[PDB]
UniProtKB/Swiss-Prot annotation:
Its EC number is 3.5.2.6. It catalyses: a beta-lactam + H2O = a substituted beta-amino acid. GO terms for biological process: antibiotic catabolic process; response to antibiotic. This is Metallo-beta-lactamase type 2. It is found in: Periplasm. Enterobacteriaceae carrying this gene (identified by PCR) have been isolated in Sweden, India, Pakistan, Bangladesh, England, Scotland, Northern Ireland, Australia and the USA. The organisms they were identified in were K.pneumoniae, Enterobacter cloacae, E.coli, Proteus spp, Citrobacter freundii, Morganella morganii, Providencia spp and Klebsille oxytoca. In India most isolates were from community-acquired infections rather than hospital-acquired infections, indicating the gene is widespread in the environment. Confers resistance to the different beta-lactams antibiotics (penicillin, cephalosporin and carbapenem) via the hydrolysis of the beta-lactam ring. Does not confer resistance to the polymixin colistin or the fluoroquinolone ciprofloxacin.
């Protein structure tokens, strides 16, 4: 059974109970929902003759449906997935990736925290230099994916990804959009270092003009400065 895409008034395409949006010739945003209802975004990148995934959906079934979409619309093997912190929205579908033979990667800290956060750890751990950049030996054949740990923010373990050859960087749950009224789920957050991490993210990917994030539509760099400003407000109490 194929699924046909259900095009929307916004140009997203519905496929099952997921939404897919093309951001650039070789980059798509994937969106899944949990019940109110709550959107979570990740990315799919075509890199020559393989596909790379950033984040799962909330569930194994939704993540399986992402894999079906890739099979049906791109038709290339998924070489690896990178997940950006240890919460359900980002790591809730690991078993589906593992069932499909996909090699998975996460911050070593994300893997250490996963059992406590109710998550399945990834198979491989990314480690980071003191300047925040991924150690290249721990992220082999990541193609255009540039992984950067900006410091504690939304969580202690949150990491971020830039896409070489595009103007796209993925803030994950660290960044919120330019109209956001708060910083959201602050249960696991570092209120002291959040602002510095958000600015570190901006400095790490200075040529990114499209900032993709977990919980709203892509936004400009205004999301970065807006998030930092809200993070400062908070730190001063
Ligand atoms: Cl599940
Ligand atoms: Zn989170
Ligand atoms: Zn989240």
């Amino acid at each position: 059974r194929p699924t046909i895409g259900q095009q929307m008034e916004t140009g997203d395409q519905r496929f099952g109970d997921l939404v897919f949006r093309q951001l650039a010739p070789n980059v798509w945003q994937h969106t899944s929902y949990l019940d109110g209802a709550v959107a979570s975004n990740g990315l799919i990148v075509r890199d020559g003759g393989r596909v790379l995934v950033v984040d799962t959906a909330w569930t194994d079934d939704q993540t399986a449906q992402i894999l079906n979409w890739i099979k049906q619309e791109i038709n290339l093997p998924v070489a690896l997935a990178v997940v950006t912190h240890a919460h359900q929205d980002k790591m809730g579908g690991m078993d589906a990736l593992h069932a499909a033979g996909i090699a998975t990667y996460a911050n070593a800290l994300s893997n250490q925290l996963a059992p406590q956060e109710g998550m399945v750890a990834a198979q491989h751990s990314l480690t980071f230099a003191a300047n925040g950049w991924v150690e290249p030996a721990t992220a082999p054949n990541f193609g255009p994916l540039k992984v950067f740990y900006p410091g504690p923010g939304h969580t202690s373990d949150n990491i971020t990804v830039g896409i070489d050859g595009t103007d796209i960087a993925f803030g994950g749950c660290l960044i919120k959009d330019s109209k956001a009224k708060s910083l959201g789920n602050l249960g696991d957050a570092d209120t002291e270092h959040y602002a510095a991490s958000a600015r570190a993210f901006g400095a790490a990917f200075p040529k990114a003009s499209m900032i993709v994030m977990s919980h709203s539509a892509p936004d400009s760099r205004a999301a970065i400065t807006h998030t930092a400003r809200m993070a400062d407000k908070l730190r001063l109490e």
